[PDB]
PDB file of C-alpha atoms in Angstrom:
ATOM      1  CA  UNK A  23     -19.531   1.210   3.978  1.00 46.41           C
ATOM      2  CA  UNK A  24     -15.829   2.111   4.613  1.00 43.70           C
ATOM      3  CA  UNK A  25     -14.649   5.213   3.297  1.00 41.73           C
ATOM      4  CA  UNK A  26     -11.391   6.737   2.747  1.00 40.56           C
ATOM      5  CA  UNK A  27     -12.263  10.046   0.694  1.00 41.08           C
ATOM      6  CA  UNK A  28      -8.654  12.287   0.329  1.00 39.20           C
ATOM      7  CA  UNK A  29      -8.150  15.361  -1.046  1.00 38.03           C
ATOM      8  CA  UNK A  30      -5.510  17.933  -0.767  1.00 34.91           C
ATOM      9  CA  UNK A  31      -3.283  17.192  -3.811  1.00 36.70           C
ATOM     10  CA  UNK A  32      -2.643  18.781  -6.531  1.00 31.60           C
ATOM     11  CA  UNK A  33       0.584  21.095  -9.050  1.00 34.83           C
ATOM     12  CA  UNK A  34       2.926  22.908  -6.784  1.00 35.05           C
ATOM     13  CA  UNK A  35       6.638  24.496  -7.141  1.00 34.63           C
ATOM     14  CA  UNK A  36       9.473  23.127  -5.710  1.00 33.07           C
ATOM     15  CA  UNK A  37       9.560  24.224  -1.883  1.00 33.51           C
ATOM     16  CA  UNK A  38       6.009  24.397  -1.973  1.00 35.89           C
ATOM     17  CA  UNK A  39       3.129  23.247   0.496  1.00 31.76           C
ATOM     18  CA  UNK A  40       0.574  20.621   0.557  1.00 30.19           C
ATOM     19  CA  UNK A  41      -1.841  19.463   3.392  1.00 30.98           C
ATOM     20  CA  UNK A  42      -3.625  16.108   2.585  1.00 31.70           C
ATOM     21  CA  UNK A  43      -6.868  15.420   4.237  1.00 28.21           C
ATOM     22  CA  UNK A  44      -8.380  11.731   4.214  1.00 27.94           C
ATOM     23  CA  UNK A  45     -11.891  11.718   5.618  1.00 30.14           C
ATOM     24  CA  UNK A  46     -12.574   8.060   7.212  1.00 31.63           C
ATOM     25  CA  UNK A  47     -16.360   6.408   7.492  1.00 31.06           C
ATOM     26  CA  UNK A  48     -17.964   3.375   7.987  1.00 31.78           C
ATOM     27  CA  UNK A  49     -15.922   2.474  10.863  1.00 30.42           C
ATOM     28  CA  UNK A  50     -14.404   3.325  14.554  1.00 29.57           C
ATOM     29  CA  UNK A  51     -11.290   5.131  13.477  1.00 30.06           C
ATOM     30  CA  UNK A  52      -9.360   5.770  16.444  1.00 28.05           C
ATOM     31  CA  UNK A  53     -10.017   2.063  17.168  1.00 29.55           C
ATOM     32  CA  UNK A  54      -6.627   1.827  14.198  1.00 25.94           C
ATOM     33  CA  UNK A  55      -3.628   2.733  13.215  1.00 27.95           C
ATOM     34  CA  UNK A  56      -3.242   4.745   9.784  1.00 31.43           C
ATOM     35  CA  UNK A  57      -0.793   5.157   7.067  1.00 29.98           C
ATOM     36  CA  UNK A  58       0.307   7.303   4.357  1.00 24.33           C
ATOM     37  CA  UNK A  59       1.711   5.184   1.327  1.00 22.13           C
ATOM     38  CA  UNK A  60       3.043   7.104  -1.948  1.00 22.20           C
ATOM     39  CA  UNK A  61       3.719   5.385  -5.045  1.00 22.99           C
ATOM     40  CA  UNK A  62       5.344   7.017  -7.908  1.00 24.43           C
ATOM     41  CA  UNK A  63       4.319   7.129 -11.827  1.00 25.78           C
ATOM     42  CA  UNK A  64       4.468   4.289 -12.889  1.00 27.47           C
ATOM     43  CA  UNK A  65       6.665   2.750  -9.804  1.00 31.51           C
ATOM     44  CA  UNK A  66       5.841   0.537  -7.172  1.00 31.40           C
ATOM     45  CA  UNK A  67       4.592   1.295  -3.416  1.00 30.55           C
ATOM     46  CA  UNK A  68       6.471   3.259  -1.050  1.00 32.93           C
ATOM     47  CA  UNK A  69       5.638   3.729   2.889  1.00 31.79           C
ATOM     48  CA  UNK A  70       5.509   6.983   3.372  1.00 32.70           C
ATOM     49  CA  UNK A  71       4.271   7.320   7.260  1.00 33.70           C
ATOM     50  CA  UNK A  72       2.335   5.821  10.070  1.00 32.42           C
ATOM     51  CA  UNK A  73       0.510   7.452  12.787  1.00 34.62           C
ATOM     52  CA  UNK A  74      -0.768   5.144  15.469  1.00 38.36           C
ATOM     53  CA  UNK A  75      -4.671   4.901  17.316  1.00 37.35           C
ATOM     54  CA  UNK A  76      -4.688   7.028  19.742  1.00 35.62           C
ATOM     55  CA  UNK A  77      -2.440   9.785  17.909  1.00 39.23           C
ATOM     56  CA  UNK A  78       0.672   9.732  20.048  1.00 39.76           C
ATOM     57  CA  UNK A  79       3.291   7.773  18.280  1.00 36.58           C
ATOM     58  CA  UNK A  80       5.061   8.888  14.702  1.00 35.55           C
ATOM     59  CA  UNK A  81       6.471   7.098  12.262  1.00 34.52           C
ATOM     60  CA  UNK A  82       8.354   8.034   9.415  1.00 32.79           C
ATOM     61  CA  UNK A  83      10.278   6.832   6.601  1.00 33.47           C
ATOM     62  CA  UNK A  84      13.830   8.317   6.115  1.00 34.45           C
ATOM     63  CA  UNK A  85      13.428  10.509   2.689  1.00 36.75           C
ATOM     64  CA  UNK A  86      10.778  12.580   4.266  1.00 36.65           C
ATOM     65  CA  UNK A  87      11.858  12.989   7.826  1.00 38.11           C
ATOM     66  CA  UNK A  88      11.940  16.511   8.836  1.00 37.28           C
ATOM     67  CA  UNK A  89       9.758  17.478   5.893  1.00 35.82           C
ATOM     68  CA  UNK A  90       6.605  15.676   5.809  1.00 36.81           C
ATOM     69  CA  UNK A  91       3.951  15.275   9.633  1.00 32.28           C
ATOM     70  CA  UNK A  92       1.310  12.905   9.987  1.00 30.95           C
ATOM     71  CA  UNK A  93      -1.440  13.751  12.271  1.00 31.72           C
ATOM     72  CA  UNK A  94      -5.364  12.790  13.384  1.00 31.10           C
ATOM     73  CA  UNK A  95      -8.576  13.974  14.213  1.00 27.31           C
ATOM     74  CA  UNK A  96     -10.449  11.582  16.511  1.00 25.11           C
ATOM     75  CA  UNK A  97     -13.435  13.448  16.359  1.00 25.81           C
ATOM     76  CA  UNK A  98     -13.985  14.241  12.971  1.00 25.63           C
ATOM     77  CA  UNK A  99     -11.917  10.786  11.867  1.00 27.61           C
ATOM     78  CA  UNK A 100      -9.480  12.474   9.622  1.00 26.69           C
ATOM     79  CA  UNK A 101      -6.055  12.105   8.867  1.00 23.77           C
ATOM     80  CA  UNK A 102      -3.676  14.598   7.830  1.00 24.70           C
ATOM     81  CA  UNK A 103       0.110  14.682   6.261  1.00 27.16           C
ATOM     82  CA  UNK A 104       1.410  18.209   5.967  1.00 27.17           C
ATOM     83  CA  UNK A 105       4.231  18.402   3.372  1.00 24.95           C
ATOM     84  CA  UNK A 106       6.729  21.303   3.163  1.00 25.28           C
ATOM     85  CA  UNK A 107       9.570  21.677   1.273  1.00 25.67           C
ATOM     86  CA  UNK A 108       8.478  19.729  -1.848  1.00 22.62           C
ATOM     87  CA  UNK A 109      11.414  17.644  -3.883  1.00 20.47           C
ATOM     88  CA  UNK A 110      10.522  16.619  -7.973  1.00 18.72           C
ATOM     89  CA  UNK A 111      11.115  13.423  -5.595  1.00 18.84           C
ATOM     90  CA  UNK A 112       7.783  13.622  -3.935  1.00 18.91           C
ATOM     91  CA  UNK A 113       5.629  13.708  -6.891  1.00 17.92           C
ATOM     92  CA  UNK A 114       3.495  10.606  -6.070  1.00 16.23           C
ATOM     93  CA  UNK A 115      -0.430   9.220  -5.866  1.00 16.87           C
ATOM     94  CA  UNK A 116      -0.367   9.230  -2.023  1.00 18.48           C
ATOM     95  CA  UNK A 117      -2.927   6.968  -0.459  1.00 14.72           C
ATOM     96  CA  UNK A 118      -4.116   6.361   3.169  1.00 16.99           C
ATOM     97  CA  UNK A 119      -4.153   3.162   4.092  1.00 18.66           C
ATOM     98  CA  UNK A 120      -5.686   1.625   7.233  1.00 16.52           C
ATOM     99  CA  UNK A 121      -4.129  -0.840   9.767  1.00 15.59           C
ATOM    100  CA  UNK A 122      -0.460  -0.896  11.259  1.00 19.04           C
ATOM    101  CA  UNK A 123       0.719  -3.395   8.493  1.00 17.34           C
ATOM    102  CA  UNK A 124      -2.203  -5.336   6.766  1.00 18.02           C
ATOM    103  CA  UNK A 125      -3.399  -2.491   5.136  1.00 19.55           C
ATOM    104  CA  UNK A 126      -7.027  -3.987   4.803  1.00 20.47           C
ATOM    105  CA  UNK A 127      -8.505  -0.792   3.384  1.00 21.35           C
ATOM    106  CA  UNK A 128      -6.497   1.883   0.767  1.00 19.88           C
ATOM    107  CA  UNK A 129      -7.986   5.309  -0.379  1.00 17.62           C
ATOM    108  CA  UNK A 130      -8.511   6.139  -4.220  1.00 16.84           C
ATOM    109  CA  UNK A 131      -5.692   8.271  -3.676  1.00 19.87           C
ATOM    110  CA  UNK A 132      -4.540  12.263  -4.413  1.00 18.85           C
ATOM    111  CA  UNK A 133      -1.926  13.307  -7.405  1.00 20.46           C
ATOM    112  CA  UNK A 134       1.147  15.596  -5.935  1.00 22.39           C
ATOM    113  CA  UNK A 135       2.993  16.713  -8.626  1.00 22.05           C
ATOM    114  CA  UNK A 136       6.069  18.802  -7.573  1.00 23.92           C
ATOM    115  CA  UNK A 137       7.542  20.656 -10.648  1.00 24.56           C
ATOM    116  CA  UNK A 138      19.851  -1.337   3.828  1.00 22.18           C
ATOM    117  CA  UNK A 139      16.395  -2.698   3.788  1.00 23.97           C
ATOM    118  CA  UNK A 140      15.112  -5.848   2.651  1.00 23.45           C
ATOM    119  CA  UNK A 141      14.352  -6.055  -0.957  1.00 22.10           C
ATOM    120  CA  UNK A 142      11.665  -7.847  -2.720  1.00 24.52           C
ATOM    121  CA  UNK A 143      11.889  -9.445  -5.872  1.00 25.07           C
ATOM    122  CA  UNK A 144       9.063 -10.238  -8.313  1.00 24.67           C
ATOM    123  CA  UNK A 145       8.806 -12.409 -11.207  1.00 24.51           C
ATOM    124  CA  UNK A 146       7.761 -12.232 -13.808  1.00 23.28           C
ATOM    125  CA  UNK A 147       7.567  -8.223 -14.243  1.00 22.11           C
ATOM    126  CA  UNK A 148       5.065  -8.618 -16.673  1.00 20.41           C
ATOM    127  CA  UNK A 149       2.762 -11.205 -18.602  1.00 20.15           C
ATOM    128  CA  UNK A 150       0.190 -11.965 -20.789  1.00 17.34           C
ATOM    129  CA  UNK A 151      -2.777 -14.148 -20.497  1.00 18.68           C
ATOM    130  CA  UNK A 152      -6.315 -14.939 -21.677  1.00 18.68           C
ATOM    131  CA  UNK A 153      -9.109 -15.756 -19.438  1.00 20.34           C
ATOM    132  CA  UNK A 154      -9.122 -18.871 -17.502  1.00 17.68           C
ATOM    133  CA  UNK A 155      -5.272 -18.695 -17.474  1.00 17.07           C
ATOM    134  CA  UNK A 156      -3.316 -20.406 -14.704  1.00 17.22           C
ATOM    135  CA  UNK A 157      -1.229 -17.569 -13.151  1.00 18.56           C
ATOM    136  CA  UNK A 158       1.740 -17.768 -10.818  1.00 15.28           C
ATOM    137  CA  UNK A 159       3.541 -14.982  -9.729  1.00 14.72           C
ATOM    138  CA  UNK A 160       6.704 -15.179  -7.183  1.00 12.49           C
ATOM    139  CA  UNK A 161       8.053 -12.901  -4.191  1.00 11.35           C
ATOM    140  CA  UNK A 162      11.963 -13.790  -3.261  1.00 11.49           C
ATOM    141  CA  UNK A 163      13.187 -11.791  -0.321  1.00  8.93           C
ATOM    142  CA  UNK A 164      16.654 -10.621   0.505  1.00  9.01           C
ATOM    143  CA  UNK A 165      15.902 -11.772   4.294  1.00  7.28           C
ATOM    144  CA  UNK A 166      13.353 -14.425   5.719  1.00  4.55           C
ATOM    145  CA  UNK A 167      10.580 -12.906   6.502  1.00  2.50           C
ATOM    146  CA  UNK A 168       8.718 -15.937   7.755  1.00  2.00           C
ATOM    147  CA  UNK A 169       4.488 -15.381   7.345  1.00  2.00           C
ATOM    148  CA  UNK A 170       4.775 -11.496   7.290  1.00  2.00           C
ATOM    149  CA  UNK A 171       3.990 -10.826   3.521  1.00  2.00           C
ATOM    150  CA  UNK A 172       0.990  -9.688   2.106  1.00  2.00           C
ATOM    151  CA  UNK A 173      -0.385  -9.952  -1.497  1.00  2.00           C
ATOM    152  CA  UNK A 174      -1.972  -6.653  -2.699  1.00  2.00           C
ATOM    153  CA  UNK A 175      -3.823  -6.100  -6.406  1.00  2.00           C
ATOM    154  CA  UNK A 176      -3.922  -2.891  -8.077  1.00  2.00           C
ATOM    155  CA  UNK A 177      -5.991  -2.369 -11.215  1.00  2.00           C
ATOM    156  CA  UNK A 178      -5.063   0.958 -13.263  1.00  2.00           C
ATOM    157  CA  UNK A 179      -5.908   4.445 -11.683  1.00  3.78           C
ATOM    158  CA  UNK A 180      -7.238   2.752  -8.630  1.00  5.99           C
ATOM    159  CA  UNK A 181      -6.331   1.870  -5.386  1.00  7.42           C
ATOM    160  CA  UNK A 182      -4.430  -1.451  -3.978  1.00  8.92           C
ATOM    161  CA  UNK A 183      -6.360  -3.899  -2.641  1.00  8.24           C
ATOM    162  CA  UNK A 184      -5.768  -6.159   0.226  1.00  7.19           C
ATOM    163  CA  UNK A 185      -5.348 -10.051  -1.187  1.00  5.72           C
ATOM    164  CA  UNK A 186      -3.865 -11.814   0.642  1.00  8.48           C
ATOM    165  CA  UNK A 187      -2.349 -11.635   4.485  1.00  8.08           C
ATOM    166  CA  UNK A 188       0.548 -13.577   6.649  1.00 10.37           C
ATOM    167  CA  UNK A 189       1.669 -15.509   3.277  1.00  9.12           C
ATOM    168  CA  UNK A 190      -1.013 -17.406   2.762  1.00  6.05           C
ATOM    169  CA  UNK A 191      -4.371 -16.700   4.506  1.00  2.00           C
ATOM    170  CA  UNK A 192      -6.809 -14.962   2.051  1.00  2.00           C
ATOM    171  CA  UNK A 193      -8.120 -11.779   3.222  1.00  2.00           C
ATOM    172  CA  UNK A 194     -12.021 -11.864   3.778  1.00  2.00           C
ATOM    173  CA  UNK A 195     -14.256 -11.450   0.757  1.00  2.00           C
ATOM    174  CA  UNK A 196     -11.872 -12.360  -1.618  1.00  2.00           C
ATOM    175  CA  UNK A 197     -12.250 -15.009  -4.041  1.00  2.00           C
ATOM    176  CA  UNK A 198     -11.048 -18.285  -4.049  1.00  2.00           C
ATOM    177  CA  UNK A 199      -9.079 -18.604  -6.890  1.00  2.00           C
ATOM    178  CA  UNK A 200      -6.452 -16.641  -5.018  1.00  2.00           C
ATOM    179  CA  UNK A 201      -3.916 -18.803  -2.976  1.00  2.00           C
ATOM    180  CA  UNK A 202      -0.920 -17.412  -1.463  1.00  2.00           C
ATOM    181  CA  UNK A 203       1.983 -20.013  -0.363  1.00  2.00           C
ATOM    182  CA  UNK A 204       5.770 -19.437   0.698  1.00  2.00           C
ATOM    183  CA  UNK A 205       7.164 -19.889   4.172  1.00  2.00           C
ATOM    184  CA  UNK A 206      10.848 -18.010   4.233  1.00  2.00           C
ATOM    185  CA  UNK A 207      12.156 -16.455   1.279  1.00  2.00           C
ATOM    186  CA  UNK A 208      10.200 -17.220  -1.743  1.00  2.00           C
ATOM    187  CA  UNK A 209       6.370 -16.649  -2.046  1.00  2.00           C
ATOM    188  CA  UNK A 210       3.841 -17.642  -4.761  1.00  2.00           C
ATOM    189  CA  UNK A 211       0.706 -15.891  -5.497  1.00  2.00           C
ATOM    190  CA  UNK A 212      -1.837 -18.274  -7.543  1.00  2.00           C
ATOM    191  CA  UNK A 213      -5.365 -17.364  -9.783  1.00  2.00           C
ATOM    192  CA  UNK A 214      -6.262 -20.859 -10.611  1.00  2.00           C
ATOM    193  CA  UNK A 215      -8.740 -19.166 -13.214  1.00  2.00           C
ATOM    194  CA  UNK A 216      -8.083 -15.818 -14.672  1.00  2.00           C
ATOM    195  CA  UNK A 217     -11.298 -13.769 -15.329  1.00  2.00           C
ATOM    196  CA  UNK A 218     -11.123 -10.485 -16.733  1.00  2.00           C
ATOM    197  CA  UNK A 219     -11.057  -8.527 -13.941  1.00  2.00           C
ATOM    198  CA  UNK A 220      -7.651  -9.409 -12.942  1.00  2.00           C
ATOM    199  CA  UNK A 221      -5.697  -7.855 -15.315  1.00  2.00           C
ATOM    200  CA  UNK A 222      -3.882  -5.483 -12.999  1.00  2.00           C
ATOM    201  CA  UNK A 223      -0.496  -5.441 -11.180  1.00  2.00           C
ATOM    202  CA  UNK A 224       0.227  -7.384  -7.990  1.00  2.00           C
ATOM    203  CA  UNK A 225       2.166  -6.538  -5.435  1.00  2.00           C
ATOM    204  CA  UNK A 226       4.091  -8.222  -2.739  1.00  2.00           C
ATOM    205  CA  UNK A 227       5.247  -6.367   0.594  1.00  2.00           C
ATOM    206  CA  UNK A 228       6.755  -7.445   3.654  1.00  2.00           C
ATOM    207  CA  UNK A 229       6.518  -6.628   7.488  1.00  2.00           C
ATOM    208  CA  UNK A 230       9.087  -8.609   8.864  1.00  2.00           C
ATOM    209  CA  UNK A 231      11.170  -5.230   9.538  1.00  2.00           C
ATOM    210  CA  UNK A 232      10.766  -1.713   9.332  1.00  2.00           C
ATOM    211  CA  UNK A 233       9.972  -0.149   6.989  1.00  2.00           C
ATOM    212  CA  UNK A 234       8.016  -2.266   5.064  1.00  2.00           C
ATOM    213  CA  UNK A 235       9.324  -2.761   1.603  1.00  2.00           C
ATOM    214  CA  UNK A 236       6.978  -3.096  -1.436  1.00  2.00           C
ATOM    215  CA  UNK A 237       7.711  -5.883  -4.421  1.00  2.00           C
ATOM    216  CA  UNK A 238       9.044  -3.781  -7.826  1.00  2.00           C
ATOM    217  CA  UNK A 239       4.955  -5.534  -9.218  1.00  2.00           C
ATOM    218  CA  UNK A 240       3.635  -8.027 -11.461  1.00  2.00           C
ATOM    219  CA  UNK A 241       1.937  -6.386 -14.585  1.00  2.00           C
ATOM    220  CA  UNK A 242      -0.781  -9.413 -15.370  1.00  2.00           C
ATOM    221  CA  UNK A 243      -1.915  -7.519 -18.740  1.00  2.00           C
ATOM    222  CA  UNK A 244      -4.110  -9.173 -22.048  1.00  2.00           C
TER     223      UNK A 244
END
């Protein structure tokens, strides 16, 4: 029943405008936090901005301070990033996603095409399996983070997914052959049983500090 719909995106000059619009349903939206999360072709996730419930409070990452302004319609339960000044940079499938840091619920997301903190380590960047494999993936951190890391899947041309949350509890209606584990640095996401609908790329992100940094992925192909 929840519903992020965007739209906005699209082919735009250098120094060009955008305004992306993501319609929210199926919930109370000002009862949350939002965020705007942009992740380059064929790179991993980056935080782009957060807006908090009420509206009041800004967040924003440092490449796209000054340029880019998040903003919400209570009302109508919409949110809204205005971006000016386009870089090549920018060119991203940006994606609301709900929640300060969990990020429970992501948006198909819209195509832009324009034409110090803690890192996060996965391995392996890519592998091969069959169904029923035994898969183990690993998240090291340059910092401890403690519990704050969440598991995310991503199949191709869709949105992330919420796995796992705080390490190791497993987010609700999620199967159980997903297991998260790791309690400072190093994190292991487990699918006792690979079925076909895995084969995607996994991600790994942190909350500990600001901003929250994204794991470079885990390709789990056939």
């Amino acid at each position: 029943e929840v519903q992020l719909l965007e739209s906005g995106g699209g082919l735009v000059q250098p120094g060009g405008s955008l305004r992306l619009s993501c319609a929210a349903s199926g919930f109370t939206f000002s009862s949350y936090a939002m965020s705007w999360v942009r992740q380059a072709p064929g790179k991993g996730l980056e935080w782009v901005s957060s807006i908090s419930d009420n509206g009041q409070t800004t967040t924003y990452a440092d490449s796209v301070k000054g340029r880019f302004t998040i903003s919400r319609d209570n009302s109508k339960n919409t949110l809204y990033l205005q971006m000016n000044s386009l870089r090549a940079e920018d060119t991203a499938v940006y994606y609301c996603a709900k929640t300060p840091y969990l990020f429970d619920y992501w948006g198909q997301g819209t195509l832009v095409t324009v034409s110090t903190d803690i890192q996060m380590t996965q391995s392996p960047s890519s592998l091969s399996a069959s169904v029923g494999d035994r898969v183990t993936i690993t998240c090291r951190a340059s910092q401890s983070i403690s519990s704050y890391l969440n598991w995310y899947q991503q199949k191709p041309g869709k949105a992330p997914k919420l796995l796992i949350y705080s390490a190791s509890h497993l987010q609700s209606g999620v199967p159980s052959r997903f297991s998260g584990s790791g309690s400072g640095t190093d994190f292991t996401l487990t699918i006792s049983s690979l079925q076909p609908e895995d084969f995607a790329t996994y991600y790994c992100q942190q909350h500990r500090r600001p901003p929250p940094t994204f794991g470079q992925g885990t390709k789990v192909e056939i």
